Each structure stands twice: as structure tokens, then as C-alpha cells.
Amino acid sequence: PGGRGRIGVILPANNAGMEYDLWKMAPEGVSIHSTRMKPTKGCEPENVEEFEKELKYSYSLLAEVSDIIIYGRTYGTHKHAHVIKRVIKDVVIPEESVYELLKKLNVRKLWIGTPYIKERTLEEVEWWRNKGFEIVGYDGLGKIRGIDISNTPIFTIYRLVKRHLNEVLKADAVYIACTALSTYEAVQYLHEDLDMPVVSENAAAMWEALNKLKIKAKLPGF
């Protein structure tokens, strides 16, 4: 029973990494409660009313046990963030959390690691690039299926970044995209070794949620 706080999380059916990260980061007295959503074809809502209806439903399943809710998907966050914010009051959108965290950390140069194939990696890059960050470098694991992404080993994530040391060192911080990756440990190793903030999407999400709820906690990587 989360007497200190209860965090609800809506995530994709095949995401097997976020729940683990969230619990590992949850301070004493805090509990995580999740519900899943149908896996989707694209990365954005085809039918907005359809999306909003399903979103409201999942939200209704978490509304009473949650003190705050995290939208743990990337789907619909780029072009329909307003729909999500509309349905879920005070919702935490990991991608936006990353932005605030990086800003609060005075980050201008960024190195981006992802689990995606080149194409998506680049889009991810341009997204952040189009938000004012200078992207000194990037790379991806070249995966497609979420379950496969979730299965990524700690050090595979670690070497994904370390392999580009020379350029990684030119950044003010590193960002590891996708909530399907369990970055709880990887991010700590990277942070210690690179001596710079290493921000994962899951850690950023917890950072924002814990701040809004006002619960002291030492997140990993920064």
C-alpha cells in the first residue's frame, strides 16, 4: 500500500522494461500501478476520437489508485500531446520530462542513444535537434519489436554509448530514448564513467512524477 504515494502508469502491451525501472526507482512507501494499451501500427493516432476514447478508458482504470499518472508510450506524444493532457490531468509525458530535466541541467550539446533502426534514430535526432539541442552524435540498437527492445542487457545499452566515446565526450549529457529499455543500471554505469548526466526516458519520467508528488528520491544517472 503506497502510503507515501501511488504512481499509475499506462504503457504498451509489450513493454517489459519500464515497470521494472519504475519499481527499482520507487522510494519506500511508493508503489507503481499499471495498465496496458493495445499495440499500434503507426507512431501517431490515425483516428483521434478512437485514441481519445481508449485513452480515457485506460485512464479510468488507474484514476482511483493513482496519485499521478505517467503516459509511458511515445505513440501520440509528438502530434497529439494535447489530447493526452486533455484526458489525463497532470499526466507525465516522459519525453517532455526529458526536455525539462535536460534544460534544468543546462544542456546544449547532446548525444542520443536509441534502440531503433537508423531511420527512426535519425527522426529521433531531428526531433531533439529541432528543439534547440546540438546533437554531437547518435546511434541505435536497430530493433523493431518492443519485447526485443525490452530484452536488451544492461551492458548492451552501456556499449551502445561507450562505443562512440570520443564524440559522446563532446556532449553535455547523453539521452537514451524509449521506455521499453530497462536503464536503471546502465545509466548509473554510464554516468559514473562519462562523468556527465546520462538521462534515460524512464528516469526522467520518475524525476517529474516524484517532483510533482513531492517525494524525495535519488534517481539514477544524474
Q: What is the rounded distance in angstroms from the CA atom of residue 16 to the CA atom of residue 173?
A: 26
Q: Does 202 bind its own copies (CB under 8 A)?
A: no
Among 77, 195, 200, 202, binds its own copies (CB under 8 A): 195
Q: Does 172 bind its own copies (CB under 8 A)?
A: no
Residue closer to its own copies, measured from CB, 46 or 195? 195
Report CA-CA distances (Å) from 116 to 75, 89, 119.
Answer: 14, 30, 8
Of residues 147, 144, 129, 118, the one with CA closest to residue 43: 144
Q: Does 81 bind its own copies (CB under 8 A)?
A: no
Among 51, 99, 116, 189, binds its own copies (CB under 8 A): 189
DSSP string across 179-219: TTS--TTHHHHHHHHHTS-EEEHHHHHHHHHHHHHT-----
Q: Does 218 bind its own copies (CB under 8 A)?
A: no
Residue closer to its own copies, measured from CB, 128 or 181? 181
Residue closer to its own copies, measured from CB, 67 or 95? 67
Size of residue set near its own copies by CB under 8 A: 50
Residue closer to its own copies, measured from CB, 77 or 151? 151
Q: Which three cell numbers stand for residue 109?
A: 550539446
Adjacent-strand bridge partners of 92:
70
Among 97, 121, 150, 202, binds its own copies (CB under 8 A): 150
Residue window 1-40: x/- pattern of binding to its own copies, with contact defined by CB under 8 A: xxxx-x------xxxxx-xx--x-----x-xxxxxxxx--
Coil, helix or strand at residue 176: strand
Cα of first residue to Cα of last residue in the chain, in angstroms, is 28
CB of 147 to its own copies, least distance (A): 5
Find out whether 184 and 21 touch, Cβ atoms under 8 Å.
yes
Find out whether 36 and 11 touch, Cβ atoms under 8 Å.
yes
Q: Does 50 bind its own copies (CB under 8 A)?
A: no
The footprint of its own copies (CB under 8 A) covers: 1-4, 6, 13-17, 19-20, 23, 29, 31-38, 58, 60-62, 64-65, 147, 150-156, 158-159, 162, 165, 169, 182, 189, 192-195, 214-216
